[PDB]
Amino acid sequence: NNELSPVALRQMSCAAGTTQTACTDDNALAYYNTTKGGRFVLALLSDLQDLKWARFPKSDGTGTIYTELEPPCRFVTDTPKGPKVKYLYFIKGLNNLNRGMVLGSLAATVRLQ
Amino acid sequence: AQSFLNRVCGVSAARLTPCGTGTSTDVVYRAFDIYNDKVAGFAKFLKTNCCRFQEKDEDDNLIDSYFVVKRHTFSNYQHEETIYNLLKDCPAVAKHDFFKFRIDGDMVPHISRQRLTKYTMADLVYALRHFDEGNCDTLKEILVTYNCCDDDYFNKKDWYDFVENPDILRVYANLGERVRQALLKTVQFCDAMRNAGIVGVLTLDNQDLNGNWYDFGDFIQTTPGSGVPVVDSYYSLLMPILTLTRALTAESHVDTDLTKPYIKWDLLKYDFTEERLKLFDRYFKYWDQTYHPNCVNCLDDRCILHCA
Amino acid sequence: NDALNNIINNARDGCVPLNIIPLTTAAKLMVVIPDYNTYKNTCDGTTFTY
Numbered sequence: 434n435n436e437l438s439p440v441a442l443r444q445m446s447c448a449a450g451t452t453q454t455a456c457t458d459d460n461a462l463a464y465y466n467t468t469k470g471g472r473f474v475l476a477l478l479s480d481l482q483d484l485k486w487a488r489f490p491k492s493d494g495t496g497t498i499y500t501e502l503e504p505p506c507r508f509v510t511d512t513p514k515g516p517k518v519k520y521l522y523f524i525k526g527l528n529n530l531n532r533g534m535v536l537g538s539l540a541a542t543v544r545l546q
Numbered sequence: 547a548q549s550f551l552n553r554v555c556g557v558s559a560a561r562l563t564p565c566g567t568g569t570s571t572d573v574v575y576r577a578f579d580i581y582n583d584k585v586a587g588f589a590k591f592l593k594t595n596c597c598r599f600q601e602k603d604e605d606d607n608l609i610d611s612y613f614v615v616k617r618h619t620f621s622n623y624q625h626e627e628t629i630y631n632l633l634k635d636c637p638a639v640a641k642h643d644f645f646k647f648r649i650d651g652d653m654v655p656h657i658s659r660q661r662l663t664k665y666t667m668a669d670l671v672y673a674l675r676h677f678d679e680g681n682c683d684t685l686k687e688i689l690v691t692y693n694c695c696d697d698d699y700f701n702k703k704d705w706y707d708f709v710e711n712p713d714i715l716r717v718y719a720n721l722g723e724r725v726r727q728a729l730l731k732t733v734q735f736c737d738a739m740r741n742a743g744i745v746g747v748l749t750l751d752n753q754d755l756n757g758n759w760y761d762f763g764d765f766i767q768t769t770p771g772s773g774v775p776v777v778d779s780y781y782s783l784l785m786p787i788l789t790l791t792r793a794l795t796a797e798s799h800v801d802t803d804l805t806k807p808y809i810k811w812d813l814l815k816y817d818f819t820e821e822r823l824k825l826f827d828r829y830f831k832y833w834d835q836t837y838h839p840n841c842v843n844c845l846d847d848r849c850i851l852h853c854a
Numbered sequence: 855n856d857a858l859n860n861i862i863n864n865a866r867d868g869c870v871p872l873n874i875i876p877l878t879t880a881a882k883l884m885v886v887i888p889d890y891n892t893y894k895n896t897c898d899g900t901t902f903t904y
């Protein structure tokens with residue numbers, strides 16, 4: 434028995450955009466896990482087609498962490514929204530285990546087709 | 547009873563003979579790579595829930611081919627059936643058979659895996675990484691089953707020593723082609739998993755010594771073309787065995803064929819960078835860390851170790 | 855010599871491995887033989903190939 438993710442993870446929102454200063458506000462679904470030394474955000478998700486630069490305020494309030502994305506993958510899900518068409522976005526450089534955990538929790542709890 | 551054996555044999559017509567008493571299981575001590583919410587490690591546990599039947603060749607001789615049929619609840623049955631139906635066209639996947647039988651006033655589902663090997667890759671890795679000359683029966687049996695040596699070779703005691711009797715390296719290097727074929731089949735399986743949309747972790751105890759894969763019990767589904775195989779502990783635990791057995795020897799022959807002459811290189815050639823990238827692409831396609839053939843381009847000393 | 859110039863002008867940058875310089879340009883060879891069977895397998899007769 435070797436499993437993908439016993440004990441799941443959490444998520445709250447963040448901002449995103451197309452280019453460097455295109456960030457307006459909440460446009461994403463950015464998954465994360467809380468490391469003691471700052472929480473690492475894992476997986477973004479978009480109703481928009483082509484985003485390439487998201488941004489997160491610092492734990493100190495001085496700087497801001499930028500996150501540029503790789504090309505998306507499309508999928509549609511079901512919920513009282515009916516057809517729920519989106520594009521998953523993994524922060525570029527995310528390795529295979531992190532994508533595995535994200536997809537695991539997502540497809541396990543969130544409806545998919 | 548005996549209708550059980552006839553149902554297990556199926557359309558294969560294989561002349562099976564029991565390895566246990568009746569329709570009861572068979573307990574063995576085997577090596578597993580385990581990680582869940584309670585325990586973790588690479589250790590020898592007690593495998594219980596399986597009935598095994600050994601296939602008989604003609605002339606009534608027993609061959610190294612087994613039918614392993616185990617017993618399931620009604621949910622894992624459907625889960626494995628769905629995943630297998632998605633993955634049944636790969637040549638690196640073992641043959642499965644799902645049915646229902648009557649043991650008592652009950653109908654119980656069974657899953658049969660056809661034509662497996664007595665040992666797995668985890669058994670070989672554990673045997674060679676936890677060597678103890680006071681008890682090494684698994685290693686002896688693996689060595690004599692695949693024609694690396696004969697049974698009396700173990701009478702020239704000090705036979706395991708590397709300094710005394712340096713001839714054991716020639717005996718160990720007879721497993722290299724088996725290991726190389728296993729690597730190729732793993733790459734094939736990963737490609738199929740990605741194209742079908744399956745996400746799972748690959749362990750050494752779900753591959754036999756022929757190279758075939760089974761046990762799709764912890765796998766999940768996504769959209770096709772977006773699957774993810776996780777292969778971080780497989781390759782890493784298997785790494786020390788690739789140089790002991792000299793698995794890549796066939797790469798020095800004309801068309802990767804051991805029955806052909808050696809490649810004759812130009813003497814004035816020293817670079818060999820594209821060859822290194824081709825080898826990495828052929829055997830380690832889904833290892834997802836950057837590889838630098840020249841360590842002038844590495845980022846720190848951890849990367850230097852990784853690439854060297 | 856003229857062989858060294860040849861094998862250096864056959865390189866694509868002027869760099870060659872050092873271990874091949876004696877192998878292709880040296881004019882004299884020395885062989886050290888431990889016993890008779892090795893002599894019979896390597897330096898037999900008046901001329902040999904290597």
Ligand SMILES: Nc1nc2c(ncn2[C@@H]2O[C@H](COP(=O)(O)OP(=O)(O)NP(=O)(O)O)[C@@H](O)[C@H]2O)c(=O)[nH]1
Nearest residue numbers: 434576593612662663664665666751752754761763
């Ligand atoms: N290859 C092989 N394995 C056997 C045989 N008999 C017992 N086994 C054991 O059965 C294991 C595979 O059974 P299975 O339970 O389906 O896989 P698993 O690795 O235990 N994972 P899980 O417990 O989640 O199903 C092998 O790893 C090995 O330890 C046999 O004849 N051949």
Ligand SMILES: [Zn+2]
Nearest residue numbers: 838844849853
């Ligand atoms: Zn490097």
